[PDB]
Write a protein that binds this ligand. Structure first.
Ligand SMILES: [Mg+2]
Length: 165
RNA sequence: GGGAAGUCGGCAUCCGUAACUUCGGGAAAAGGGCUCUAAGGGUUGGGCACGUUGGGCUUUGGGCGGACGC
């Protein structure tokens, strides 16, 4: 999987955990998006430098859910690594049209049996990773409206987590 | 009964009632579950057609044997 990345000439995207977050200076790299804010507050800076290297425009953007975890903006401000809001794309969201293209995954989940149990094991794994977030003042499991992550992750049926609804 | 009135000098404590506790196993949700880091039992298993090569289904011929028996 690593070799086919670095040798590919067509536009490519890796889907990775923190494996490629520190050190690897892959060439011709331009874009990073952070689907989940780092659980450790010291790998964001390293992750940004994965897109950068020398002169090249480093498209480093991170998502943030609405709520108190907007404060990740000024958490890094006092990290002395200021982060500004996105301006360059400025194409934000299509709202329901973003929901029904996320729906385009859900019937694919219906079509494919194996992708069914892959879904929650992805969900519970994310549930475990959030519960252990080091900063227990900006990230919290309490104010976590669940039924839109199932919509966000295209989950067919929210499993038997401790929280019941 | 009196009270020095004689003489110098008399003296695992036990039962009932109300809360509390031992042994073993065990970090990292609860009772489908995080990153990285090393081992995570072995053995065997890559499709479909063509003209193509080989022996593999009829046909043709040859050779060695030409035999056995009379
Ligand atoms: Mg380095």
């Amino acid at each position: 999987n690593y070799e086919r990345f670095v040798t590919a000439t067509s536009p490519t995207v890796l889907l990775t955990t923190d494996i490629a977050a520190r050190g690897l200076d892959i060439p011709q790299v331009d874009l990073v998006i952070q689907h989940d804010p780092p659980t450790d507050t010291k790998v964001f800076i390293h992750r940004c430098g994965r897109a950068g290297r020398a002169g090249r425009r480093g498209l480093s953007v991170v998502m943030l859910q609405p709520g108190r975890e907007e404060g990740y903006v000024q958490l890094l401000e006092v990290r002395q690594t200021p982060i500004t809001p996105l301006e360059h794309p400025q194409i934000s969201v299509t709202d329901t049209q973003a929901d029904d293209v996320a729906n385009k995954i859900r019937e694919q989940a219906k079509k494919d049996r194996e992708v069914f149990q892959l879904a929650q094991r992805a969900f519970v794994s994310w549930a475990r990773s959030y519960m252990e977030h080091q900063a227990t003042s900006i990230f919290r499991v309490a104010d976590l409206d669940w039924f839109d992550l199932a919509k966000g992750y295209g989950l067919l049926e929210l499993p038997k987590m401790p929280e019941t609804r």
